[PDB]
UniProtKB/Swiss-Prot annotation:
Full protein stretch here: 17 to 270 of 993
Purpose: Global regulatory protein for secondary metabolite formation.
Segment forming the signal sequence: none
Gene that encodes the chain: afsR
DNA-binding region: 1-97
Domain comment (free text): The N-terminal and the C-terminal regions are independently capable of directing actinorhodin production.
Protein name according to UniProt: Regulatory protein AfsR
Length: 254
DNA sequence: TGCGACGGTCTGACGCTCTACACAGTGCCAGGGGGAGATAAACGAACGCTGAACGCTCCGG
């Protein structure tokens, strides 16, 4: 609320895509219109051609006379948005005139970069606040209810990036000494994510430093059984190494 | 026709890499035809809301 500048236009892509003019929300429109807006936004104001926009929205099988569909989608964007924010260059469209902090993806990138810089500088409270601000950006699943293979690719990429953000965040939480909340939320996540090995290693190191051991090795046994049932292979050697060093009761982690 | 000579025509002028680069002085606008992009509407489609309605276990007086 402290950065609510007058005349500032804010866009939301990390969840359901939305447009905010000075605090009031705009009617984005149809799901394909929303996906076109997302495709034009994530390129950081780079000119995307109409054929590439068609490929991003629809993929391999477009209808024959539906370039005018993208034309009227862009016209509806220019209706909803400013006349000058969306510019037409070389037959394509680009969302220009965006100030800093306008796009939530760029804000997340800057927050992650600042968190990494503070990790390099060793500042725990500052990077903790930066990651707290970062996690308060996306609401629910990214790109909710939009079609297209580009939308699917962005969805899975940003979900994976959020997974690594949670991994780094909670590894730092185990570094600073936050046991209870970490154990609870990682139990919830591994209930949601059954085959994510990194989060389960985080559960192992968290429970080893929290005074709880039985459910830790129970989760580990379930992990090996499910990984053998669904894949037929052996888990990563780092998980076995950390479990072995847990078994010998090494006081370095404690 | 035989003669030299006069002349044009035509050809290549061993092999490779290490190296290896680019190329410069004199007109001007109006009228008209097409297709690129924005517009607002349109015919058809399926997308939702309406809970209703059928049937099940159900705790039960």
């Amino acid at each position: 609320a402290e950065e609510e500048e007058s005349g500032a236009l804010r866009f939301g892509v990390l969840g359901p895509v939305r447009a905010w003019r000075d605090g009031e929300t705009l009617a984005t429109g149809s799901p394909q219109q929303r996906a076109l807006l997302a495709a034009l936004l994530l390129r950081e104001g780079r000119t995307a051609t109409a054929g590439e926009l068609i490929d991003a929205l629809w993929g391999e099988e477009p209808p024959s006379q539906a370039l005018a569909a993208v034309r009227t989608y862009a016209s509806r964007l220019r209706k909803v948005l400013d006349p000058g924010v969306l510019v037409s260059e070389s037959g394509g469209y680009a969302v220009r005139g965006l100030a800093e902090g306008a796009l939530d993806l760029a804000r997340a990138q800057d927050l992650a970069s600042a968190a990494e810089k503070a990790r390099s500088a060793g500042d725990l409270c500052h990077a903790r606040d930066l990651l707290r601000r970062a996690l308060d950006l996306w609401d629910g699943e990214v790109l909710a209810g939009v079609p297209g293979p580009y939308a699917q690719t962005q969805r899975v990429r940003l979900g994976e990036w959020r997974l690594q953000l949670l991994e780094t965040r909670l590894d730092m939480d185990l570094d600073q000494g936050c046991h209870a909340e970490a154990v609870s939320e990682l139990t919830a996540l591994t209930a949601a994510h059954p085959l994510r090995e990194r989060l389960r290693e985080l559960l192992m190191l968290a429970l080893y430093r929290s005074g709880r051991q039985a459910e830790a090795l129970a989760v580990y046994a379930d992990t090996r059984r499910l990984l053998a049932d669904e894949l037929g292979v052996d888990p990563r050697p780092g998980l076995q190494e950390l479990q072995q060093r847990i078994l010998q009761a090494d006081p370095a982690l404690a």
